[PDB]
Structure formats: C-alpha cells, structure tokens
Amino acid sequence: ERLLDELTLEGVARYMQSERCRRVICLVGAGISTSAGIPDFRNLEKYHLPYPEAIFEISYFKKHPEPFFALAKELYPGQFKPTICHYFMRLLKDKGLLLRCYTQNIDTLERIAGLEQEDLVEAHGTFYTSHCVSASCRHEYPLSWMKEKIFSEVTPKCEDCQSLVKPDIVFFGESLPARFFSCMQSDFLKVDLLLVMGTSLQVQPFASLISKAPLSTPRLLINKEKAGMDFDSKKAYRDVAWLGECDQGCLALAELLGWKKELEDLVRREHASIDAQ
C-alpha cells in the first residue's frame, strides 16, 4: 500500500490527521536528550583503556568498573528535565496515538515527561535503579545511593556480599529485557506510523525494529543525519527524513498538526514544575 500522499513532513502530518493513522510507535535514541544536557555517550586517559568502547562492554566493566563510574561523574546532569521531543511523545500519549515508545536511552526522561511504564520499552534499561551483580543476592540500591558513590568516587559495592553494584543499564554484551521481545512481537504487527527520533540506528538488536513493521507503515526520521530505509531512490514510497535537531523537528511537525501552542504550553508548565522542586 501507499499511505503517504507525498514523502514530506507535510505528507506525514496529513497522514497523522487522517482516520487511518491510529497507533504510532516511537523509536528514540541519544539525540532526543542532548538538549537536556545529556551528551551522546558514543580525563579517561589515566585508565589506559584497550580501546574507547571497552568502557560500555560488560566483560571489561565487571573487572574494571572505575572508568565507567569516572565517566558517569562527568556525564551526570544537574537536573533531569525532558526536552520538547519528550513532550511531543507526551502529546501523542494524551491524544491516544501512542502505541509504544522504544527507547535506547537510560536517562529516565520519558518517565519524567509523563510516559507511564506500560507506554515504554526501556530497551537498554535504566540508570534509575541499581543492583548487586551476584545472582544469589541481587540487593537493590536507589539512585541517591548510586549518585553518592559516583560523586564520592567510591566504586559501588554491595553492603551484603561485597560484589559490584551496577546501574540497571544493559551494557554491550548483555541481554535486553524480556519486555523488549514480548512487546516487539505484538506492537509491530499492527502499527500505523514509526517515528524514529535522535538515533542513527547503529545499536543491535534495537536497530532491527524498523524492519519489523508492515511494509506499508510510513516511517519518519527526525535526526541530525540519515540512518533498511529508502528516502531518495526511485523506489522510495514510505520513508521521510527531516534533518536537524529533534526539538526543532518536533516543533515543525507540531505546527503542521496544529499542536504548536499546546506543545509549548506543556513544555513550559512542566519545566516550571521541575524548576520549582
């Protein structure tokens, strides 16, 4: 099927406004959180890492966790404040359009923006909660405990069994949560639109999600750069790229949908609430 009239942001907006477009899946990455003061993870010289990527690999981390926690100290934001892009997804939720948000991010900003547990697949886990790595113990630790360890530069260690404590993030080389595969098996059978934001789709198996949708499902990319997507060839029929920052892409789309005022009000009242804490 051909569902978009034209392969443009205006085309996608018209499609979203039509009765046909009922359920939208968002697929999001690091680019949706850069304007919230969280840099794209993709001083440390003193650790003499075998290569830079070892810092996020589970095998390296379990034996040498210090570089990761050193980086965590530098990356840790002074505040957790979701972006315009996060609040665009909140609008999708409130308008009954959000089937699911699959996130690569560990920053909890989707939760803070008001997406509920059931709205979310936190594909790479979360920094919010932490656990001892020992299967026979699994002692839980809260963010305040983890933050204290990070800022004091004391490696997190279990108070019961002395094992390493890690944030509940999926390190490279670890399995994704069962929820990722369970939701994937259902959500991509019947979805009207994929909204792919702030990701270059370089991390597997998350990147494979775009191919799981029906062949007729239109797909909009909002990202600083291009990404099995076809925007430009003579065979292009359903994929649209909008190139720039995620906040500005979501503002442009919101304006076309007639949501610009609603989105700006939402961002401002929610930011005010967070700043008042």
């Binding site: 790479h124 999926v170 490279f172 080389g173 670890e174 399995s175 994704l176 597997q204 198996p205």
Partner: peptide, 7 residues
C-alpha cells in the same frame, strides 16, 4: 536472544 552490540 541477540545481545546488545555495536552492529
């Protein structure tokens, strides 16, 4: 299942 990988 497929582990988290850079590609």
């Amino acid at each position: 299942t497929a582990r988290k990988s850079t590609g």
